[PDB]
Amino acid sequence: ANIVGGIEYSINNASLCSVGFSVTRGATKGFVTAGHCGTVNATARIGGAVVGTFAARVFPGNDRAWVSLTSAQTLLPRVANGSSFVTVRGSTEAAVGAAVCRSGRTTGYQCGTITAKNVTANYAEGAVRGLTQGNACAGRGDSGGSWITSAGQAQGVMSGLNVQSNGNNCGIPASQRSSLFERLQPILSQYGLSLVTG
């Protein structure tokens, strides 16, 4: 499979999440995703085919994971936006007020702005701290997906949101959305990963 940020992958033939970003760790290929998506050694599939396994994760507390891929996989410096792509150029952290988009398998590519940093989410499992909040909307299944600026700077991976009964927060005004993502920089240094860019 071609590994592009935003695309669907399954975990142990049951939950779905979205790919965050292609990365490497020496000769190993992988992608970063959300911690709550799978446990260590869970099998990841893209399109019915095994692409890799969860190599490490931290959830709750933080919400981060990276999946190590087999070498057959093609890592690409790209995030899906409909039939188009946004090139990943780097990982400069954007400030509050900055515009940002996110990509996932449930709501596709959505944009909004960053509204606050260092938010705590109190999920059923425990708190996750240090999250950035944006008001771009998202839905169940978008976990793990890319948050990136149009400029191509990788911000983080989708963690959670104030979901409504329709499975997303896209039908409430931007003002009432709390879409939270895990920052990329701590995940990259914690696992010693380098982002694939183009």
Binding site: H36, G141, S143, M158, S159, G160, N162, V163
Partner: peptide, 4 residues
Amino acid sequence: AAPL
């Protein structure tokens, strides 16, 4: 807010 819930995971995702």
